[PDB]
Write a protein that binds this ligand. Sequence first.
Ligand SMILES: [Zn+2]
Ligand SMILES: [Zn+2]
Ligand SMILES: [Zn+2]
Ligand SMILES: [Zn+2]
Lengths: 463, 463
Amino acid sequence: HHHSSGLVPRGSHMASTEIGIIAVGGYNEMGRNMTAIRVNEDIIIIDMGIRLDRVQIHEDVDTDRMHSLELIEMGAIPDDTIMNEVNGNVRAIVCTHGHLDHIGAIPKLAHRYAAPIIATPYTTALIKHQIDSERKFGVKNNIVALKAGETLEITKDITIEFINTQHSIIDTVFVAIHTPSGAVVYACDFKFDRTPTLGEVPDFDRLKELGKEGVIALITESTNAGRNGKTPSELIAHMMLKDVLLGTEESAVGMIVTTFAAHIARVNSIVQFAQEMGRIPVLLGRSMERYVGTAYQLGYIDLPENVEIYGSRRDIDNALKKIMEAGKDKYLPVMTGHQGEPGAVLGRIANGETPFKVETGDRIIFSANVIPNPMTQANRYALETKLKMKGARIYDNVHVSGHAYREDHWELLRMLKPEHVIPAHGTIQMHSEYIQMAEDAGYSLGDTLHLLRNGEELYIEED
Amino acid sequence: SSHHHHHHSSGLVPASTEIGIIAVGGYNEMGRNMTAIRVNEDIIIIDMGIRLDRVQIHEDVDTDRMHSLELIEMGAIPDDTIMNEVNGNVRAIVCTHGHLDHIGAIPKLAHRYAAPIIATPYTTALIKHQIDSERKFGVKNNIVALKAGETLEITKDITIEFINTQHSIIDTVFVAIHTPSGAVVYACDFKFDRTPTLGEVPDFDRLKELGKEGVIALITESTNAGRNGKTPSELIAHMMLKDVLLGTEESAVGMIVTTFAAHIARVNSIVQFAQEMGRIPVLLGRSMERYVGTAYQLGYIDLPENVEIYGSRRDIDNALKKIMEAGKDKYLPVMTGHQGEPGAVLGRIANGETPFKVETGDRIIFSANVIPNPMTQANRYALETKLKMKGARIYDNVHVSGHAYREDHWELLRMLKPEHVIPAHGTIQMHSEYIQMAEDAGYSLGDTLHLLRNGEELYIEED
RNA sequence: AAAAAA
RNA sequence: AAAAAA
Ligand SMILES: [Zn+2]
Ligand SMILES: [Zn+2]
Ligand SMILES: [Zn+2]
Ligand SMILES: [Zn+2]
């Protein structure tokens, strides 16, 4: 009557953890990133960012005076009101680095959470400055510096680990949240760089170790997952910049370099080249003085003792007057204004509001890309037109990306071996590209590969 | 009553040379370049090239068997019949380098001119091979090897000087035709590279000397004059390739590199990297063997004694079978097929017509660009689809251009100080970009800056 | 941005 | 691909 069919060994389940991946902002767009990681009833927030272009489309703005609710209505700050309906209490806010798409919304949203703000030293300095620049939301959260390779136990069941990585700003980290059932890894704004000009090479060994210890979920940026191959190293930008600055038959012509003030590796390269060219490096711009000086006071960069740094309008105008009468061949001005921002040094120069006069053949080196949005594109077009009309020669895009490419994401999937993968930090189109890469690696959409929209919670019941 | 005055000039001399710039091919399109420089009745032809896409659009066509007139009707070679209306006798044919857009039409057009063919040693080797495979015209011009930095006296009034430059193939030169009234400089397919991995740095000193001695006219390529800034050095391609090949956590996976067979510097880099990776470099492909062997056999490269080189179908299939049974992680195959050419090694592999089987995770590195015309785009798309469907990971465009950018052209204008400038070697759109740069430098179109079409002769007289 | 092809 | 603004 009855035949035996077979046997199956049932596994043990010694620890049941309910994980929640909550997408607050930056899953439908570039900017205003915010993620919440729930471990049963505790919540770790990662990255309260701003979306700058939605600010730029309104002329009468002054983000500093606006309340967070209007900023949410504008879509510039993550709509974190969904947090009142996530089942848990926030125990920490973590920021992976100091870019505004990760810390820009801190002074508008952090004060409502009874939780510290945990970040790397440079990031904590930048967060403190960002909060100090507003006196409308009095945000006085405890601010904790956690260095890369260090751990901090936030709950008996939750620990936070920073992993060193590379990016277009120093002191970027992966975040690993360790839970009774494994690790949740957050990797947004990262880049593998085996030859960085500043810092150490990302911790591939620890990444393999984490992959072997158990990763429940990987939250990772999708920004350049559609660019084939691997990201070029910062060394490539360094060498291209060296060739533009030194490899020329027009040594004694005027030269200006503009780049991101927070791109400390790039700025460091530029000032060392200045020493090679026999020119004095002159950093111009409030943001230049702030960011480079902060880096210097934390021991992140070294600086030649002939460097000159001016952030004040009249010190800047005076330095430019001194440069003009001493000879532009005698200095290398590194200044703000690469996106044509009004009020930045290069834009005031282009408008003739300056003692510095651009002449035919003067070289202007944009060690940056143009941010692909119509607003910044219009500003850069106006600035470049003005500079070209005064005879300047433009060296654009002397630059490499700060984001992992498709094959970098492939390698990170192979190292971390996550049970689940969640693309973050982009549009649904960038997520599409990531999804096709992840399917190539074995993941399945809606099963182990998850497409989230702003305001959605993915629940993971890990045995 | 009314009165004024004027000084009449003397009709006396304080012996007249007429210069002619004749555009035959390559001024309306990419490919089939050919220029004629006339000094009163003597003519120096520069570059009889082929335009390959006009061949590719016709099904199953044997250019080697075709007459010159059918090829001209196809648009695939310069229409030199206009030479029967130019008042002079051709005294020399000069080729600036061995690319097919400069030498491909030689076995169809050179034999009708009572003149030698003058080129650099490597270029002469390639020309001799090109003639040997010709099967319709009996070509018996003498081929004279002239090294860079040497001069050769062609007529009582005309000498030819080669100046070394950098390009995507070794032994490229500028040509300076010295006449009684000054020099005519031809600079097509050149690139400034202060750190080349092969050859010497272009002779900037001689270029300045020429500019000060007197240059009547500069004929120059416009190919990338619309690219802002300066061309990245070949060292950049070298370092990107080094990082792709060496910078990975997947040491023991299969890797295949494809690149231009004539890019001897790139191939040299790849083989030295193979030595670093602990793999055996195996060059596969008829063109690979021909070009690399000619370079090695003339002392342009050195090669490790473990290198293997196979141009024959069965040596190739045997080497691939040996690679599969010895382990793909133990070899670095450098092969033809980067444009998806049918019959090339990579294409036959993708078609599964070889012992080599591509598996998931195998890396295919195109150290090349996709040539922007619909035919090669279709071929590369088919090849890439086939490779991706077999699990390959694609690293594309690990590559830098071999052509000067806008500011490189600016500095060459500043060095050579030509009286007249003539853009060549591109479409009228590329010439538009050049013209806009040259107007920035003081030239005026139709006066000292001249946009010529195929089949036009520009006259340059003495004041 | 000018091949591949034995 | 996330600013500037003494
Ligand atoms: Zn960032
Ligand atoms: Zn970001
Ligand atoms: Zn060429
Ligand atoms: Zn060419």
